[PDB]
Amino acid sequence: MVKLNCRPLCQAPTASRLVSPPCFICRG
Amino acid sequence: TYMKIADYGQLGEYTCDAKCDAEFGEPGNIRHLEGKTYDYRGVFCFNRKNLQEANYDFLSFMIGAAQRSHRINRNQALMIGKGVNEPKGWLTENCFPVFQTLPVDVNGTSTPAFLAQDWRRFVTSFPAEYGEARSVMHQNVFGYLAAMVDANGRFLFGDGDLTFTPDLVRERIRISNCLPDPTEGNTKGGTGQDAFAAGSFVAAQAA
């Protein structure tokens, strides 16, 4: 029985958009 | 060399009562690690006759010139140093999770901007189970938050005292003048031909 052990070599660069609440708009 | 516990497994999964057996879960990981240290060296030359019959001491100036150059280069390398024979910095290796702010419209166009929404959303978006975490940012970047205005014209921070001065250390801020300070010199935060040059590093926060 073989116990495969795997890791990644390079990590991909990430980018998250830091969205924020939009300005208050009336309903109506 | 050192160890780094990667992740635990899962063993105790709910099962039926009326059965005299169990289920073998999966184990975790250990991931033994290592690491090195790099050297910093160099040489210079003086002239016996020139240094001797000179106006004043030149040697001791060079020692002071060497200790500071090492001091500033180490910190500069410790932040952005490329892996090769230099300590891997936390800026360029792109291992930290990095956010980015979406631009705003102006006169139909769309220029990158850094609102007061971001810095309040950024510092308050950090896992509260990692403990406290200070933040780091250049002085000119902090001068950008201070002189912020609303639509009418009043200030956003410290309305009516000509200076904000918020006692930084109380609120997890530590100013340093090594950071890329996205405002080029002290003028890149505009609306027209002074676009914010999307892609620069504003500030970091970490334990």
Binding site: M1, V2, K3, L4, N5, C6, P8, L9 | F24
Partner: protein, 137 residues
């Protein structure tokens, strides 16, 4: 500063795309595997571990190809239909990630890996080598 890490832990090719290779593990006392792909996969991919004996003509030449029976540890739930060892590269392994494995009971003089029948298309995309641990002489 990197030491000459080829005077111990010396590696050899085991499966270079479309060719198997016997790698002597006689002197060395411990060994594992290091699987790395070169492209994307399509389906699952298995392999058949083997072993050989020194031929009577020359004690330093490969003989026939005999399989290795998979010895089970504790906490085993399934055994191959024939009880012979086999490694399986799971689906969805990106070709920038190395996988490690080994047989827990050495037998013979050298090891050899070959793709299991019906799974020799993806076998081209995989790249397998073998490292060592000890000298003993």
């Amino acid at each position: 500063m990197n030491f000459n890490v080829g005077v111990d832990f010396p590696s050899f090719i085991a499966w270079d795309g479309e060719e198997s290779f016997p790698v002597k593990v006689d002197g060395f006392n411990q060994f594992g595997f290091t699987f790395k792909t070169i492209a994307a996969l399509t389906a699952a991919t298995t392999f058949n571990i083997f072993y050989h004996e020194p031929s009577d003509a020359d004690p330093c030449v490969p003989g026939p190809a005999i399989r290795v029976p998979e010895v089970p540890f504790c906490d085993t739930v399934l055994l191959s239909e024939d009880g012979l060892a086999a490694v399986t590269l799971p689906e969805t392994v990106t070709p920038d990630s190395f996988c490690a494995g080994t047989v827990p009971c050495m037998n013979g003089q050298w090891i050899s890996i070959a793709p299991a029948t019906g799974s020799e298309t993806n076998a081209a995309n995989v790249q397998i080598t073998v490292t060592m641990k000890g000298a003993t002489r």
